Design a protein around this nucleic acid. Structure first.
Length: 257
DNA sequence: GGCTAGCGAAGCTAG
Protein backbone atom coordinates (compact mmCIF):
# COMPACT_ATOMS: atom_id res chain seq x y z
CA UNK A 1 0.00 0.00 0.00
CA UNK A 2 1.13 3.56 -0.77
CA UNK A 3 -0.56 6.97 -0.68
CA UNK A 4 0.94 9.93 -2.56
CA UNK A 5 -0.36 13.52 -2.73
CA UNK A 6 0.57 16.50 -4.91
CA UNK A 7 -0.35 20.07 -3.97
CA UNK A 8 0.46 23.50 -5.41
CA UNK A 9 0.39 25.54 -2.20
CA UNK A 10 0.94 29.02 -3.74
CA UNK A 11 3.53 30.10 -1.14
CA UNK A 12 4.36 27.66 1.66
CA UNK A 13 4.90 30.47 4.18
CA UNK A 14 1.15 31.12 3.90
CA UNK A 15 -0.02 27.51 3.55
CA UNK A 16 2.25 25.85 6.14
CA UNK A 17 -0.48 25.39 8.82
CA UNK A 18 -2.70 23.70 6.22
CA UNK A 19 0.21 21.55 5.01
CA UNK A 20 0.78 20.40 8.60
CA UNK A 21 -2.92 19.68 9.13
CA UNK A 22 -2.81 17.65 5.91
CA UNK A 23 0.12 15.64 7.29
CA UNK A 24 -1.49 14.94 10.67
CA UNK A 25 -5.00 14.12 9.42
CA UNK A 26 -5.11 11.18 6.95
CA UNK A 27 -1.37 11.27 6.20
CA UNK A 28 -0.01 10.22 2.83
CA UNK A 29 3.24 8.33 2.57
CA UNK A 30 4.58 11.03 0.22
CA UNK A 31 3.54 14.68 -0.20
CA UNK A 32 5.06 16.75 -3.01
CA UNK A 33 4.65 20.52 -3.19
CA UNK A 34 4.91 23.22 -5.85
CA UNK A 35 5.32 27.01 -5.72
CA UNK A 36 6.99 27.10 -2.32
CA UNK A 37 7.99 30.70 -3.17
CA UNK A 38 10.87 30.70 -0.68
CA UNK A 39 14.63 30.51 -0.97
CA UNK A 40 16.69 27.39 -0.28
CA UNK A 41 17.47 28.50 3.28
CA UNK A 42 13.90 29.59 4.15
CA UNK A 43 12.25 26.17 3.99
CA UNK A 44 10.50 25.22 7.31
CA UNK A 45 12.47 22.01 7.73
CA UNK A 46 12.44 22.03 11.54
CA UNK A 47 8.64 22.30 11.76
CA UNK A 48 8.11 19.31 9.45
CA UNK A 49 11.03 17.30 10.84
CA UNK A 50 9.64 17.64 14.37
CA UNK A 51 6.47 15.94 13.09
CA UNK A 52 8.58 13.06 11.77
CA UNK A 53 8.96 13.83 8.05
CA UNK A 54 12.00 13.83 5.79
CA UNK A 55 12.25 16.82 3.46
CA UNK A 56 14.15 17.49 0.24
CA UNK A 57 13.45 20.70 -1.65
CA UNK A 58 14.71 23.10 -4.31
CA UNK A 59 13.92 26.74 -3.60
CA UNK A 60 14.51 30.24 -4.93
CA UNK A 61 13.29 33.65 -3.84
CA UNK A 62 9.73 34.71 -4.71
CA UNK A 63 8.92 32.23 -7.49
CA UNK A 64 8.68 28.51 -8.25
CA UNK A 65 9.94 26.03 -5.63
CA UNK A 66 9.34 22.27 -5.32
CA UNK A 67 9.62 19.86 -2.39
CA UNK A 68 9.25 16.16 -1.49
CA UNK A 69 8.04 15.19 2.00
CA UNK A 70 7.97 11.57 3.18
CA UNK A 71 8.14 9.30 6.21
CA UNK A 72 10.97 7.23 4.70
CA UNK A 73 14.23 8.74 3.48
CA UNK A 74 14.19 10.08 -0.11
CA UNK A 75 17.27 8.72 -1.90
CA UNK A 76 19.32 9.75 -4.93
CA UNK A 77 17.97 13.29 -5.07
CA UNK A 78 18.25 14.97 -8.48
CA UNK A 79 17.74 18.70 -9.09
CA UNK A 80 16.54 20.14 -12.39
CA UNK A 81 16.63 18.93 -15.97
CA UNK A 82 19.91 17.79 -17.59
CA UNK A 83 18.77 19.01 -21.02
CA UNK A 84 18.24 22.51 -19.54
CA UNK A 85 21.26 23.02 -17.26
CA UNK A 86 21.40 26.84 -17.29
CA UNK A 87 17.78 27.39 -16.18
CA UNK A 88 17.82 28.97 -12.69
CA UNK A 89 14.07 28.44 -12.12
CA UNK A 90 13.62 25.72 -9.48
CA UNK A 91 10.89 23.54 -10.99
CA UNK A 92 12.00 19.87 -10.83
CA UNK A 93 13.17 17.61 -8.01
CA UNK A 94 13.32 13.81 -8.14
CA UNK A 95 14.00 11.22 -5.44
CA UNK A 96 13.49 7.49 -4.84
CA UNK A 97 11.15 6.79 -1.91
CA UNK A 98 10.54 3.15 -0.91
CA UNK A 99 11.48 1.86 -4.36
CA UNK A 100 9.28 4.37 -6.25
CA UNK A 101 10.92 7.07 -8.37
CA UNK A 102 9.13 10.35 -7.61
CA UNK A 103 9.53 13.25 -10.06
CA UNK A 104 7.90 16.43 -8.74
CA UNK A 105 7.40 19.14 -11.37
CA UNK A 106 6.08 22.68 -11.21
CA UNK A 107 5.65 23.02 -14.96
CA UNK A 108 5.89 26.40 -16.70
CA UNK A 109 2.61 28.31 -16.74
CA UNK A 110 3.24 30.02 -20.09
CA UNK A 111 1.10 33.14 -19.43
CA UNK A 112 -0.20 33.33 -23.02
CA UNK A 113 0.40 31.60 -26.34
CA UNK A 114 2.09 34.72 -27.78
CA UNK A 115 4.11 35.31 -24.59
CA UNK A 116 7.88 34.68 -24.54
CA UNK A 117 7.09 32.46 -21.55
CA UNK A 118 5.26 30.11 -23.94
CA UNK A 119 8.44 29.35 -25.91
CA UNK A 120 10.14 28.77 -22.56
CA UNK A 121 7.28 26.39 -21.71
CA UNK A 122 7.88 24.64 -25.04
CA UNK A 123 11.62 24.13 -24.49
CA UNK A 124 11.00 23.17 -20.86
CA UNK A 125 8.50 20.41 -21.67
CA UNK A 126 10.89 19.11 -24.34
CA UNK A 127 13.68 19.01 -21.75
CA UNK A 128 11.33 17.33 -19.26
CA UNK A 129 10.37 14.62 -21.77
CA UNK A 130 13.99 13.54 -22.29
CA UNK A 131 14.61 13.45 -18.53
CA UNK A 132 11.58 11.28 -17.75
CA UNK A 133 12.50 8.99 -20.66
CA UNK A 134 15.99 8.42 -19.27
CA UNK A 135 14.68 8.00 -15.72
CA UNK A 136 12.14 5.42 -16.90
CA UNK A 137 14.88 3.14 -18.26
CA UNK A 138 16.04 2.62 -14.65
CA UNK A 139 12.90 2.69 -12.45
CA UNK A 140 10.04 0.34 -13.23
CA UNK A 141 7.99 2.04 -10.50
CA UNK A 142 7.92 5.74 -11.39
CA UNK A 143 5.49 8.59 -10.70
CA UNK A 144 5.62 11.92 -12.54
CA UNK A 145 3.31 14.31 -10.73
CA UNK A 146 2.73 17.97 -9.96
CA UNK A 147 1.28 21.12 -11.54
CA UNK A 148 1.46 20.56 -15.29
CA UNK A 149 -0.45 23.78 -16.12
CA UNK A 150 -2.11 21.84 -18.97
CA UNK A 151 -5.75 20.74 -19.10
CA UNK A 152 -5.51 17.48 -21.11
CA UNK A 153 -8.97 17.44 -22.75
CA UNK A 154 -12.17 19.46 -22.94
CA UNK A 155 -13.66 17.52 -20.02
CA UNK A 156 -10.87 19.22 -18.01
CA UNK A 157 -12.04 22.76 -18.87
CA UNK A 158 -15.27 24.37 -17.66
CA UNK A 159 -15.83 26.28 -20.95
CA UNK A 160 -13.92 24.75 -23.87
CA UNK A 161 -15.19 27.24 -26.47
CA UNK A 162 -14.15 30.25 -24.38
CA UNK A 163 -10.74 28.61 -23.82
CA UNK A 164 -10.28 27.61 -27.47
CA UNK A 165 -6.53 27.65 -28.17
CA UNK A 166 -6.03 29.60 -24.95
CA UNK A 167 -3.27 29.02 -22.41
CA UNK A 168 -3.39 25.68 -20.52
CA UNK A 169 -5.90 24.41 -23.10
CA UNK A 170 -4.26 24.88 -26.52
CA UNK A 171 -3.81 21.92 -28.87
CA UNK A 172 0.00 22.25 -28.85
CA UNK A 173 0.12 22.19 -25.04
CA UNK A 174 -2.08 19.10 -25.21
CA UNK A 175 0.44 17.51 -27.57
CA UNK A 176 3.21 18.18 -25.03
CA UNK A 177 1.13 16.40 -22.39
CA UNK A 178 0.57 13.59 -24.90
CA UNK A 179 4.33 13.35 -25.49
CA UNK A 180 4.71 12.57 -21.78
CA UNK A 181 1.99 9.91 -21.94
CA UNK A 182 3.71 8.35 -24.98
CA UNK A 183 6.68 7.44 -22.76
CA UNK A 184 4.46 4.82 -21.12
CA UNK A 185 2.82 7.00 -18.46
CA UNK A 186 -0.85 6.81 -17.44
CA UNK A 187 -3.14 9.68 -16.48
CA UNK A 188 -3.99 7.95 -13.21
CA UNK A 189 -7.20 9.87 -12.48
CA UNK A 190 -8.66 9.13 -15.93
CA UNK A 191 -7.97 5.42 -15.44
CA UNK A 192 -10.00 5.56 -12.22
CA UNK A 193 -12.53 8.13 -13.49
CA UNK A 194 -12.74 8.09 -17.31
CA UNK A 195 -15.55 10.68 -17.23
CA UNK A 196 -16.72 13.55 -15.08
CA UNK A 197 -15.30 16.93 -14.08
CA UNK A 198 -12.34 16.70 -11.68
CA UNK A 199 -10.99 20.25 -11.62
CA UNK A 200 -7.87 20.90 -9.53
CA UNK A 201 -7.44 24.68 -9.96
CA UNK A 202 -10.07 27.38 -9.44
CA UNK A 203 -9.30 31.03 -10.16
CA UNK A 204 -9.30 33.28 -7.10
CA UNK A 205 -11.31 35.86 -9.07
CA UNK A 206 -15.06 35.78 -9.55
CA UNK A 207 -15.61 33.12 -6.85
CA UNK A 208 -14.83 30.42 -9.40
CA UNK A 209 -14.46 27.71 -6.75
CA UNK A 210 -17.94 28.42 -5.36
CA UNK A 211 -19.22 28.15 -8.95
CA UNK A 212 -17.16 24.93 -9.34
CA UNK A 213 -15.70 26.34 -12.58
CA UNK A 214 -12.03 25.45 -12.95
CA UNK A 215 -9.47 23.28 -14.75
CA UNK A 216 -7.80 19.91 -14.22
CA UNK A 217 -4.09 20.75 -14.48
CA UNK A 218 -2.63 18.96 -11.44
CA UNK A 219 -1.94 15.35 -12.40
CA UNK A 220 -0.32 12.11 -11.24
CA UNK A 221 1.24 10.19 -14.15
CA UNK A 222 2.38 6.65 -13.35
CA UNK A 223 4.45 3.93 -14.99
CA UNK A 224 2.89 0.63 -16.15
CA UNK A 225 3.75 -1.19 -12.91
CA UNK A 226 2.27 1.64 -10.84
CA UNK A 227 -0.83 1.77 -13.06
CA UNK A 228 -1.50 -1.93 -12.45
CA UNK A 229 -1.38 -1.25 -8.69
CA UNK A 230 -3.57 1.87 -8.82
CA UNK A 231 -6.76 1.73 -6.76
CA UNK A 232 -8.07 5.29 -6.37
CA UNK A 233 -7.43 8.95 -7.22
CA UNK A 234 -9.27 11.81 -5.51
CA UNK A 235 -9.22 15.61 -5.55
CA UNK A 236 -9.42 17.12 -2.06
CA UNK A 237 -11.89 19.98 -2.39
CA UNK A 238 -12.22 20.28 1.40
CA UNK A 239 -8.75 21.84 1.49
CA UNK A 240 -9.65 24.11 -1.43
CA UNK A 241 -12.67 25.24 0.65
CA UNK A 242 -10.62 26.39 3.65
CA UNK A 243 -10.38 30.03 4.66
CA UNK A 244 -7.52 31.74 2.79
CA UNK A 245 -6.96 28.76 0.49
CA UNK A 246 -4.52 27.88 -2.20
CA UNK A 247 -6.10 28.17 -5.63
CA UNK A 248 -5.11 24.54 -6.31
CA UNK A 249 -6.61 21.50 -4.64
CA UNK A 250 -4.49 18.51 -3.55
CA UNK A 251 -4.63 15.35 -5.65
CA UNK A 252 -4.01 11.98 -4.00
CA UNK A 253 -3.37 8.67 -5.75
CA UNK A 254 -3.59 5.39 -3.82
CA UNK A 255 -1.82 2.17 -4.78
CA UNK A 256 -1.83 -1.33 -3.28
CA UNK A 257 1.50 -3.20 -3.30
C1' DG B 1 -10.99 40.14 -13.87
C1' DG B 2 -13.27 42.94 -11.34
C1' DC B 3 -8.10 37.89 -6.39
C1' DT B 4 -3.82 36.53 -4.07
C1' DA B 5 0.98 36.77 -2.82
C1' DG B 6 5.75 38.81 -2.98
C1' DC B 7 8.46 42.76 -2.44
C1' DG B 8 8.40 46.31 0.48
C1' DA B 9 6.22 50.14 1.93
C1' DA B 10 3.80 52.12 -3.57
C1' DG B 11 2.00 50.01 -7.38
C1' DC B 12 3.99 46.51 -10.22
C1' DT B 13 4.92 40.99 -11.80
C1' DA B 14 3.41 36.63 -11.67
C1' DG B 15 0.24 33.27 -11.08
Amino acid sequence: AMKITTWNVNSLNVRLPQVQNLLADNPPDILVLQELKLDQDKFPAAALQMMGWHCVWSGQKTYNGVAIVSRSVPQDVHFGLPALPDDPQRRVIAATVSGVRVINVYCVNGEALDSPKFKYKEQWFAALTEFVRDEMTRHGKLVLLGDFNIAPADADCYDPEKWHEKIHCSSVERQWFQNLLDLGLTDSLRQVHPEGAFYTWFDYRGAMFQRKLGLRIDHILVSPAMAAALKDVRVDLETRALERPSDHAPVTAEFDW
